[PDB]
Short mmCIF file of C-alpha atoms in Angstrom, two decimals:
data_model
loop_
_atom_site.label_atom_id
_atom_site.label_comp_id
_atom_site.label_asym_id
_atom_site.label_seq_id
_atom_site.Cartn_x
_atom_site.Cartn_y
_atom_site.Cartn_z
CA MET A 2 -119.27 87.62 52.79
CA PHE A 3 -120.23 88.83 49.47
CA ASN A 4 -119.56 92.18 46.22
CA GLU A 5 -122.54 94.16 46.25
CA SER A 6 -122.06 94.05 42.61
CA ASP A 7 -122.29 97.52 41.86
CA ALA A 8 -119.61 98.17 44.63
CA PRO A 9 -116.20 99.71 43.44
CA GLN A 10 -113.23 96.94 43.33
CA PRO A 11 -109.51 98.06 44.60
CA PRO A 12 -107.00 97.43 42.89
CA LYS A 13 -105.19 94.00 42.96
CA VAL A 14 -101.69 93.85 43.69
CA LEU A 15 -99.60 91.40 42.73
CA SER A 16 -96.46 90.12 43.27
CA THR A 17 -96.13 85.86 43.08
CA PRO A 18 -93.76 86.01 39.92
CA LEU A 19 -96.09 82.18 39.00
CA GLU A 20 -99.25 85.52 38.87
CA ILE A 21 -97.33 88.32 37.28
CA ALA A 22 -95.90 86.21 34.19
CA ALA A 23 -100.05 84.49 34.30
CA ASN A 24 -100.73 87.57 33.73
CA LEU A 25 -98.27 89.25 31.36
CA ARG A 26 -98.37 85.79 28.68
CA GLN A 27 -102.00 86.89 28.80
CA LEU A 28 -101.04 90.16 26.92
CA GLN A 29 -99.43 88.10 24.60
CA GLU A 30 -101.64 86.24 24.02
CA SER A 31 -104.48 88.16 23.51
CA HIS A 32 -102.37 91.18 21.51
CA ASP A 33 -103.58 93.31 23.94
CA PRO A 34 -102.34 97.08 23.15
CA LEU A 35 -100.24 98.48 25.50
CA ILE A 36 -99.43 102.43 26.13
CA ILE A 37 -96.21 103.12 27.65
CA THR A 38 -95.82 106.86 29.45
CA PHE A 39 -91.82 107.37 29.83
CA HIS A 40 -91.85 109.76 33.20
CA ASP A 41 -91.00 112.61 32.40
CA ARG A 42 -92.65 112.68 28.43
CA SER A 43 -96.10 114.06 26.66
CA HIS A 44 -96.20 111.94 23.84
CA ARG A 45 -98.40 108.26 25.79
CA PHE A 46 -96.99 105.01 22.55
CA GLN A 47 -97.86 102.05 21.72
CA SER A 48 -96.92 98.38 21.76
CA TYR A 49 -97.67 95.07 22.62
CA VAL A 50 -96.22 91.93 25.22
CA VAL A 51 -93.83 89.83 22.84
CA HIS A 52 -92.92 87.44 24.54
CA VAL A 53 -92.28 86.04 27.92
CA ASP A 54 -90.32 83.89 29.73
CA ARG A 55 -90.20 83.06 32.90
CA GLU A 56 -87.24 80.37 32.68
CA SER A 57 -85.03 83.26 31.70
CA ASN A 58 -86.58 86.13 32.90
CA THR A 59 -87.27 87.90 30.29
CA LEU A 60 -90.34 90.48 29.15
CA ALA A 61 -90.15 92.17 25.61
CA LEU A 62 -91.85 94.38 24.41
CA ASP A 63 -93.35 95.66 20.71
CA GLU A 64 -91.24 98.26 18.90
CA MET A 65 -93.20 101.74 20.17
CA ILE A 66 -96.20 103.18 17.68
CA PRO A 67 -94.54 105.79 16.50
CA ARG A 68 -91.60 104.32 16.52
CA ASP A 69 -89.30 107.52 17.51
CA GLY A 70 -90.61 106.77 20.61
CA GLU A 71 -87.56 104.82 20.65
CA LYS A 72 -84.92 107.36 21.45
CA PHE A 73 -86.98 106.90 25.28
CA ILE A 74 -85.84 103.65 25.71
CA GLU A 75 -81.95 104.59 23.88
CA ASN A 76 -82.32 106.17 27.38
CA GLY A 77 -82.93 104.35 29.55
CA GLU A 78 -85.88 106.22 30.60
CA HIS A 79 -88.18 104.89 33.30
CA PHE A 80 -91.89 104.44 32.19
CA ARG A 81 -95.25 102.91 33.31
CA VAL A 82 -96.87 100.15 31.42
CA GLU A 83 -100.48 99.92 30.77
CA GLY A 84 -102.82 97.51 29.11
CA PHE A 85 -106.26 95.39 29.67
CA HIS A 86 -107.25 91.82 29.16
CA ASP A 87 -110.58 90.57 29.35
CA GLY A 88 -111.38 94.07 30.76
CA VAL A 89 -109.17 93.45 33.61
CA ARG A 90 -106.29 97.17 33.46
CA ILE A 91 -103.05 95.26 33.89
CA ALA A 92 -100.48 97.87 35.27
CA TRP A 93 -96.42 97.43 35.70
CA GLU A 94 -93.46 99.76 35.84
CA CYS A 95 -89.99 99.28 34.06
CA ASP A 96 -87.19 102.21 37.14
CA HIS A 97 -84.73 100.53 34.40
CA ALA A 98 -83.17 99.97 30.55
CA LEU A 99 -83.59 97.69 28.64
CA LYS A 100 -81.90 95.74 25.81
CA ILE A 101 -82.70 96.34 22.15
CA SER A 102 -82.76 93.42 20.16
CA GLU A 103 -85.33 91.00 17.90
CA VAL A 104 -87.88 88.65 18.08
CA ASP A 105 -89.26 86.92 14.72
CA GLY A 106 -87.96 89.99 12.38
CA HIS A 107 -89.32 92.76 14.21
CA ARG A 108 -87.69 94.84 16.85
CA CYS A 109 -88.13 94.31 20.20
CA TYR A 110 -86.83 95.74 23.94
CA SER A 111 -86.26 93.22 26.73
CA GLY A 112 -85.79 92.82 30.35
CA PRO A 113 -86.37 90.99 33.14
CA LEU A 114 -89.47 90.34 33.94
CA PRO A 115 -91.77 93.28 37.13
CA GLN A 116 -91.44 91.93 40.29
CA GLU A 117 -95.08 93.74 40.82
CA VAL A 118 -97.89 94.26 39.29
CA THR A 119 -101.27 96.16 39.30
CA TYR A 120 -104.54 94.24 38.39
CA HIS A 121 -107.39 96.62 38.59
CA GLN A 122 -111.11 95.94 37.19
CA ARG A 123 -112.21 99.44 37.19
CA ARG A 124 -115.70 99.67 35.37
CA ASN A 125 -118.27 100.00 38.66
CA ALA A 126 -116.30 102.84 39.19
CA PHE A 127 -116.95 103.93 36.25
CA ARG A 128 -120.52 102.83 36.48
CA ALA A 129 -120.66 105.19 39.74
CA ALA A 130 -118.45 108.07 38.00
CA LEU A 131 -121.12 108.14 34.94
CA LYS A 132 -124.35 108.32 37.68
CA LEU A 133 -125.51 105.27 37.03
CA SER A 134 -125.21 103.51 39.88
CA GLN A 135 -123.35 104.03 43.86
CA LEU A 136 -126.39 106.43 44.13
CA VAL A 137 -127.66 107.81 47.09
CA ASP A 138 -131.04 107.01 48.39
CA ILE A 139 -133.42 109.80 48.63
CA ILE A 140 -137.48 109.97 50.27
CA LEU A 141 -139.14 113.24 48.56
CA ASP A 142 -142.38 113.49 50.93
CA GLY A 143 -144.81 116.61 52.22
CA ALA A 144 -148.33 117.35 52.60
CA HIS A 145 -148.32 118.68 49.82
CA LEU A 146 -148.23 115.80 47.55
CA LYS A 147 -150.41 113.98 46.34
CA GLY A 148 -150.80 110.47 45.49
CA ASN A 149 -150.00 107.62 48.95
CA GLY A 150 -146.21 106.29 49.58
CA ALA A 151 -143.01 109.22 49.98
CA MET A 152 -141.93 109.02 47.01
CA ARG A 153 -138.34 106.65 46.63
CA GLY A 154 -135.87 107.98 43.79
CA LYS A 155 -132.24 109.08 43.39
CA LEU A 156 -129.51 111.36 44.16
CA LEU A 157 -128.27 112.07 41.05
CA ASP A 158 -126.21 116.10 41.59
CA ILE A 159 -125.74 117.90 44.65
CA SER A 160 -124.45 121.37 45.51
CA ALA A 161 -125.04 123.80 48.69
CA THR A 162 -127.61 124.67 47.16
CA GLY A 163 -130.14 121.77 46.04
CA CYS A 164 -129.52 118.74 44.12
CA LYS A 165 -130.82 116.90 40.71
CA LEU A 166 -133.27 113.32 41.36
CA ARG A 167 -134.13 110.61 39.60
CA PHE A 168 -137.54 108.46 39.83
CA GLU A 169 -138.69 105.43 37.76
CA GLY A 170 -142.26 105.67 35.52
CA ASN A 171 -143.88 108.49 35.03
CA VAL A 172 -143.90 111.22 38.52
CA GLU A 173 -145.09 114.28 37.32
CA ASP A 174 -148.47 114.70 38.58
CA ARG A 175 -147.59 113.14 42.13
CA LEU A 176 -145.27 116.82 41.64
CA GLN A 177 -146.12 120.95 41.04
CA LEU A 178 -143.79 123.01 40.31
CA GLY A 179 -142.74 125.56 43.03
CA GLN A 180 -144.26 123.45 45.75
CA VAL A 181 -142.41 122.64 48.74
CA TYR A 182 -141.57 119.64 50.31
CA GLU A 183 -141.03 119.38 53.93
CA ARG A 184 -140.40 115.58 53.86
CA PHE A 185 -136.32 115.53 51.94
CA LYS A 186 -134.98 112.46 53.67
CA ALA A 187 -131.23 111.68 51.39
CA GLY A 188 -129.47 108.12 53.03
CA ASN A 189 -126.22 106.97 53.84
CA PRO A 190 -123.11 107.89 53.24
CA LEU A 191 -125.37 111.48 53.15
CA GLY A 192 -127.56 110.56 55.90
CA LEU A 193 -130.38 113.77 56.15
CA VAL A 194 -133.02 113.60 58.14
CA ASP A 195 -136.35 115.75 56.80
CA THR A 196 -135.33 118.58 55.04
CA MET A 197 -137.02 121.18 53.19
CA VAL A 198 -136.88 121.31 49.24
CA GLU A 199 -138.56 123.83 46.45
CA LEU A 200 -139.56 121.98 43.35
CA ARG A 201 -137.37 123.96 40.84
CA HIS A 202 -137.56 121.73 37.60
CA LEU A 203 -139.88 119.20 36.52
CA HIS A 204 -138.77 116.64 33.40
CA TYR A 205 -140.01 112.39 32.36
CA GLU A 206 -138.50 111.69 29.90
CA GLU A 207 -139.85 108.50 28.36
CA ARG A 208 -137.79 107.07 26.69
CA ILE A 209 -136.04 106.15 29.55
CA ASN A 210 -139.19 105.91 31.18
CA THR A 211 -137.83 108.46 34.49
CA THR A 212 -138.80 111.69 35.91
CA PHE A 213 -136.32 113.23 37.05
CA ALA A 214 -136.60 117.21 39.67
CA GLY A 215 -134.29 120.06 40.35
CA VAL A 216 -134.70 120.74 44.13
CA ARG A 217 -134.00 124.49 45.56
CA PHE A 218 -133.09 123.50 49.40
CA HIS A 219 -135.55 126.06 51.50
CA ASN A 220 -134.77 127.46 54.56
CA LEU A 221 -131.53 124.43 55.69
CA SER A 222 -130.54 124.27 59.14
CA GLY A 223 -126.87 125.62 59.37
CA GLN A 224 -126.14 121.70 60.97
CA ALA A 225 -127.88 120.47 57.11
CA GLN A 226 -125.79 122.83 55.70
CA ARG A 227 -122.49 121.19 56.88
CA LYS A 228 -123.38 118.28 56.30
CA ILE A 229 -124.44 118.74 53.08
CA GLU A 230 -120.63 120.76 52.19
CA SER A 231 -119.60 117.99 53.03
CA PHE A 232 -121.33 115.14 50.70
CA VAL A 233 -119.94 117.49 47.65
CA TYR A 234 -115.48 118.52 49.42
CA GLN A 235 -115.98 114.55 49.59
CA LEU A 236 -117.93 113.43 46.11
CA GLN A 237 -115.75 116.09 43.54
CA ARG A 238 -112.76 114.96 45.48
CA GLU A 239 -113.09 111.23 44.78
CA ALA A 240 -114.56 112.86 41.02
CA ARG A 241 -110.96 113.88 40.95
CA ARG A 242 -109.71 111.28 42.07
CA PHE A 243 -111.41 109.27 39.30
CA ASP A 244 -110.79 111.90 36.20
CA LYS A 245 -107.06 111.09 36.70
CA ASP A 246 -106.46 107.90 35.29
CA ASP A 247 -103.43 106.91 37.23
CA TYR A 248 -105.18 104.22 38.91
CA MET B 2 -138.65 128.99 10.76
CA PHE B 3 -138.97 126.20 13.80
CA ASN B 4 -137.78 126.10 16.77
CA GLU B 5 -135.83 122.94 17.55
CA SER B 6 -137.85 121.43 19.71
CA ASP B 7 -134.82 120.31 22.45
CA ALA B 8 -133.32 124.68 22.32
CA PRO B 9 -133.49 126.09 25.99
CA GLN B 10 -136.25 128.49 25.01
CA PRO B 11 -134.95 132.84 26.84
CA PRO B 12 -136.51 133.96 28.54
CA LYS B 13 -139.98 136.61 28.17
CA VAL B 14 -140.68 139.33 29.29
CA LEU B 15 -144.69 140.98 29.73
CA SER B 16 -144.54 144.71 29.56
CA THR B 17 -148.52 144.80 28.66
CA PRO B 18 -150.77 145.44 31.40
CA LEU B 19 -153.28 143.16 29.63
CA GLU B 20 -150.69 140.48 29.83
CA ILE B 21 -149.17 140.28 32.76
CA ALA B 22 -152.89 140.76 34.80
CA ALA B 23 -153.61 137.27 32.78
CA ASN B 24 -150.63 135.60 33.49
CA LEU B 25 -151.40 136.95 37.68
CA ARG B 26 -154.98 135.88 37.26
CA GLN B 27 -153.26 132.32 36.70
CA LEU B 28 -151.86 132.33 39.26
CA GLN B 29 -154.48 132.70 41.69
CA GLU B 30 -156.92 130.29 39.82
CA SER B 31 -155.03 127.46 39.23
CA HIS B 32 -153.59 128.26 43.50
CA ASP B 33 -149.83 127.53 41.86
CA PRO B 34 -147.31 128.22 44.75
CA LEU B 35 -145.22 131.04 45.04
CA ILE B 36 -142.22 130.90 46.33
CA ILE B 37 -141.16 134.74 48.42
CA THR B 38 -137.26 135.66 48.45
CA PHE B 39 -136.56 138.83 50.33
CA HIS B 40 -133.62 141.46 49.83
CA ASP B 41 -131.56 140.09 52.36
CA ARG B 42 -133.01 137.24 54.61
CA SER B 43 -132.12 133.48 54.48
CA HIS B 44 -134.92 132.02 54.63
CA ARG B 45 -137.78 132.12 52.02
CA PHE B 46 -141.62 132.11 52.19
CA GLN B 47 -144.86 130.72 49.79
CA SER B 48 -147.65 132.43 48.79
CA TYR B 49 -150.38 132.85 46.82
CA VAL B 50 -152.99 134.97 44.56
CA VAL B 51 -155.19 135.41 46.33
CA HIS B 52 -156.97 138.53 44.41
CA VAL B 53 -156.20 140.33 40.82
CA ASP B 54 -158.47 143.53 39.97
CA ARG B 55 -156.51 145.29 36.54
CA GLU B 56 -159.53 147.73 36.93
CA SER B 57 -158.62 149.08 40.09
CA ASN B 58 -154.75 148.17 39.39
CA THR B 59 -154.68 145.90 43.52
CA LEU B 60 -152.72 142.69 42.97
CA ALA B 61 -152.99 140.95 46.59
CA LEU B 62 -151.35 138.24 47.64
CA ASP B 63 -151.70 135.81 50.44
CA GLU B 64 -150.22 135.29 54.51
CA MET B 65 -146.91 134.00 54.47
CA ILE B 66 -145.05 130.34 55.38
CA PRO B 67 -143.84 130.60 57.93
CA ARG B 68 -145.84 134.04 59.61
CA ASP B 69 -143.21 134.82 61.30
CA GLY B 70 -142.01 136.23 57.03
CA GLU B 71 -144.84 138.87 57.43
CA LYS B 72 -142.33 141.12 59.14
CA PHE B 73 -140.85 141.76 56.21
CA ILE B 74 -144.17 142.64 54.47
CA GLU B 75 -144.39 145.40 58.17
CA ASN B 76 -141.04 146.25 57.49
CA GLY B 77 -141.43 146.84 53.81
CA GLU B 78 -139.13 144.83 52.16
CA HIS B 79 -138.18 144.01 48.70
CA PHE B 80 -138.41 140.96 47.13
CA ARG B 81 -138.80 138.87 43.98
CA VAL B 82 -142.36 136.78 43.87
CA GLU B 83 -142.34 132.82 41.79
CA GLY B 84 -144.71 130.60 41.41
CA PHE B 85 -144.67 127.63 37.62
CA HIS B 86 -148.28 127.86 35.55
CA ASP B 87 -148.28 125.00 33.22
CA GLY B 88 -144.99 124.55 33.20
CA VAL B 89 -143.87 128.23 32.92
CA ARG B 90 -141.23 129.79 36.23
CA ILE B 91 -143.91 133.95 35.53
CA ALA B 92 -141.22 135.66 38.36
CA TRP B 93 -141.45 139.46 39.43
CA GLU B 94 -140.36 141.99 42.24
CA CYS B 95 -141.98 143.64 44.59
CA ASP B 96 -140.48 147.16 45.03
CA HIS B 97 -142.16 148.76 47.33
CA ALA B 98 -144.50 148.27 50.63
CA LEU B 99 -147.84 146.70 50.57
CA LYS B 100 -151.16 147.50 52.78
CA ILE B 101 -151.77 144.68 55.07
CA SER B 102 -155.95 144.04 54.32
CA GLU B 103 -158.20 141.03 54.85
CA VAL B 104 -160.36 139.00 51.56
CA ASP B 105 -162.73 136.38 52.17
CA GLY B 106 -161.53 135.97 56.31
CA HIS B 107 -157.49 135.76 55.49
CA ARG B 108 -155.16 138.10 55.28
CA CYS B 109 -153.77 138.97 52.30
CA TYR B 110 -150.66 141.58 51.49
CA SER B 111 -151.76 144.76 48.49
CA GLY B 112 -150.46 147.38 45.94
CA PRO B 113 -150.65 147.45 42.52
CA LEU B 114 -149.57 144.83 40.05
CA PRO B 115 -146.63 144.55 38.67
CA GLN B 116 -145.06 146.45 35.36
CA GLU B 117 -142.64 143.87 34.24
CA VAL B 118 -143.30 140.50 34.39
CA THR B 119 -141.20 137.27 32.75
CA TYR B 120 -142.37 134.45 31.18
CA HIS B 121 -139.35 131.56 31.55
CA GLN B 122 -140.11 127.96 30.43
CA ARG B 123 -137.03 125.98 31.61
CA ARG B 124 -137.49 122.81 31.16
CA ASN B 125 -134.92 122.68 27.45
CA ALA B 126 -132.94 124.11 29.58
CA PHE B 127 -133.29 121.33 32.90
CA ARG B 128 -132.60 118.87 30.10
CA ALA B 129 -129.68 119.79 28.35
CA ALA B 130 -128.22 120.23 31.86
CA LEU B 131 -129.09 116.92 32.63
CA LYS B 132 -127.60 116.04 29.64
CA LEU B 133 -129.78 114.32 27.69
CA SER B 134 -130.47 116.52 24.90
CA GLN B 135 -127.95 119.64 23.14
CA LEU B 136 -125.18 117.13 22.84
CA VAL B 137 -121.59 117.57 20.80
CA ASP B 138 -122.11 115.02 17.69
CA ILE B 139 -118.89 112.84 18.15
CA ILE B 140 -117.00 110.65 15.70
CA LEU B 141 -114.37 107.89 16.65
CA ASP B 142 -113.28 106.13 13.91
CA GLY B 143 -109.77 104.30 13.25
CA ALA B 144 -107.34 101.73 11.94
CA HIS B 145 -108.68 99.77 15.13
CA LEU B 146 -112.35 99.78 14.61
CA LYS B 147 -113.69 96.08 14.15
CA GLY B 148 -117.85 96.70 12.37
CA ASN B 149 -118.09 98.97 9.34
CA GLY B 150 -118.83 102.06 9.55
CA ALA B 151 -117.06 104.82 11.61
CA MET B 152 -119.02 105.62 14.68
CA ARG B 153 -122.07 108.12 16.09
CA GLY B 154 -122.23 108.68 19.55
CA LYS B 155 -122.79 111.41 21.59
CA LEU B 156 -119.97 113.77 24.16
CA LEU B 157 -121.47 113.15 27.76
CA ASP B 158 -118.91 115.39 29.59
CA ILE B 159 -115.35 116.75 28.29
CA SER B 160 -112.54 117.99 30.11
CA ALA B 161 -108.60 118.95 29.73
CA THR B 162 -107.56 115.23 29.64
CA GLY B 163 -110.22 113.07 28.06
CA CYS B 164 -114.24 112.56 27.74
CA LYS B 165 -117.20 110.59 28.02
CA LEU B 166 -118.87 109.61 25.42
CA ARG B 167 -122.22 107.49 24.37
CA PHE B 168 -123.13 105.45 21.99
CA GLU B 169 -126.79 103.36 21.05
CA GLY B 170 -127.28 99.49 21.37
CA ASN B 171 -124.42 97.41 22.47
CA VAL B 172 -121.38 98.70 20.66
CA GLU B 173 -118.64 97.03 22.94
CA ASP B 174 -117.17 93.77 20.52
CA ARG B 175 -116.83 97.09 18.58
CA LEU B 176 -114.13 98.83 20.78
CA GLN B 177 -111.36 97.67 22.69
CA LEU B 178 -109.51 98.78 26.16
CA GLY B 179 -106.16 100.26 25.73
CA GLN B 180 -106.74 100.29 21.91
CA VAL B 181 -106.11 103.93 20.37
CA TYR B 182 -108.70 105.53 18.23
CA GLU B 183 -107.06 108.38 15.94
CA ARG B 184 -110.25 109.54 13.94
CA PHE B 185 -111.72 110.78 16.84
CA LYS B 186 -113.73 113.49 16.09
CA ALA B 187 -116.71 116.00 17.84
CA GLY B 188 -119.56 118.73 15.30
CA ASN B 189 -120.00 121.92 16.93
CA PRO B 190 -120.09 124.88 19.02
CA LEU B 191 -117.33 121.94 20.13
CA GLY B 192 -115.53 121.24 15.96
CA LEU B 193 -112.39 119.25 16.96
CA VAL B 194 -111.30 117.29 13.83
CA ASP B 195 -108.85 113.84 14.21
CA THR B 196 -108.01 113.78 17.89
CA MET B 197 -106.41 110.71 18.93
CA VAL B 198 -107.80 108.95 21.67
CA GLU B 199 -107.02 106.07 24.23
CA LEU B 200 -109.33 103.93 25.35
CA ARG B 201 -110.16 103.70 29.13
CA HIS B 202 -113.01 102.83 30.48
CA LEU B 203 -116.34 101.46 28.09
CA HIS B 204 -119.53 99.57 30.24
CA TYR B 205 -122.61 98.25 28.03
CA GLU B 206 -125.96 99.47 30.26
CA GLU B 207 -128.60 96.96 29.20
CA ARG B 208 -131.73 98.42 31.85
CA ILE B 209 -131.01 101.55 28.69
CA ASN B 210 -129.80 99.64 25.83
CA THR B 211 -126.71 102.18 26.21
CA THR B 212 -122.76 101.47 25.43
CA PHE B 213 -121.11 104.33 27.98
CA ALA B 214 -117.03 104.98 26.77
CA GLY B 215 -114.40 106.97 28.61
CA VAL B 216 -111.26 108.21 26.39
CA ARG B 217 -108.08 109.72 27.16
CA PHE B 218 -107.00 112.15 24.65
CA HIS B 219 -103.45 111.02 22.53
CA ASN B 220 -100.45 113.45 22.09
CA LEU B 221 -102.84 116.98 22.10
CA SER B 222 -101.70 119.42 19.59
CA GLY B 223 -101.66 122.16 20.88
CA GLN B 224 -104.13 124.39 18.82
CA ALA B 225 -106.49 121.14 19.64
CA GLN B 226 -105.71 121.25 23.63
CA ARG B 227 -106.48 124.68 23.81
CA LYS B 228 -109.86 124.62 21.98
CA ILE B 229 -110.19 121.29 24.29
CA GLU B 230 -109.85 124.13 27.33
CA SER B 231 -111.91 126.82 26.38
CA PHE B 232 -114.64 123.76 25.72
CA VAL B 233 -114.29 123.53 28.97
CA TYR B 234 -114.29 126.95 29.90
CA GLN B 235 -117.64 127.92 28.11
CA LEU B 236 -118.85 124.39 29.49
CA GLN B 237 -118.54 125.23 33.42
CA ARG B 238 -119.44 128.88 32.90
CA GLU B 239 -123.28 127.72 32.15
CA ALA B 240 -123.15 125.48 34.56
CA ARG B 241 -122.96 127.06 36.70
CA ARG B 242 -125.41 130.24 35.71
CA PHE B 243 -127.68 127.49 35.09
CA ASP B 244 -126.74 126.40 39.48
CA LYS B 245 -128.00 130.00 40.18
CA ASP B 246 -131.45 129.53 39.49
CA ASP B 247 -132.56 132.87 39.60
CA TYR B 248 -133.89 133.46 35.76
#
């Protein structure tokens, strides 16, 4: 009904030539730089979209930068093409050989328009990856917590043995290093019920008005270990997937 | 001549009984909670220092929490003891069997004072680990950079294929997603000379007035690969060492 505004937006595939051509025209008109990855070449190259014509089915890219990239075009090599317009990653593949030609006195490479272009806005992914968003909600409570109300914060980082948390404001004096807090909880998709944690590190960063805690899991149950261990496995899979920078 | 104030401070070993006793008295007088790790037991336990007497060479700890920990004291088992006073981790080992006794009507365990206590202030380590400090200085410059002056920021994260950077203020419009910036530099202990990077992600976080970039290394030299690869190996070794939470 709405998009939780920090939710990562998945890739969109454009398959109509009217949409495809619009998107490529936009890259041309804004001169949004492209990167060309050839199937089995270590060096990547830059280009621009220098002509788009849906009536003739022609898409021409600019001369490669460095110009030595051109030998791979001569060779008819398959490549991925990649640019950004208004913050959105626009991508396609060229699975075929192009024509070496000129437009407005400069060498360019041409062929038919792609039948598929991807459209991916990746800001929300990036912010998640920066741990600025999509953070698991935590509660830290216990008999030894000073002040009224359980403390609400956010999970920054987790392992089999402990985690790092974030609290708004200066909440250092509510807490005691070395103390066991026997009501630690983490919301979804971790779903962890009252777990005990020992406080190991404690830092108020004034310039962002944020208190940071490092806790160690105290006498974990086996069902807790396995929930944490699976969460940790799933997290580092989405991290590795993000870092690949492949969609 | 001075301590760079964000520099991690190493552990200090106290070996004089006058210093040792002072530090243990402090834990007693402030009732700083302790954690007891037995050599080969999964559950840890809590205690306090309930008596310290340098004339008789007596150090008594409080009854274990949970009380089932006491069976390991009965057994004469070796344990590490660990507390925090005024933010400083104070630790020692008990390599011997203790006496089960009472002080002020409550059961306690006693023996001779330790001949060695550690004193470690770990705030600076933690902040480093949070990537709030000890960040490699970077420069991001190139022909396609808009505005005058090379951009100074900080390395947040690095891998073999790219890294994440931080800039103060809103510097989004100086930058272009997809563009190659051919003068990326990183100070010590990374020591990287003009390297090329492609801009892949770009996010201004307004509430902390910080612009965040994700870049991919463009056509790395082999000497650059090996400098980055060694830096990355060294970093994840200090991370694993920190997470162990063992000093």
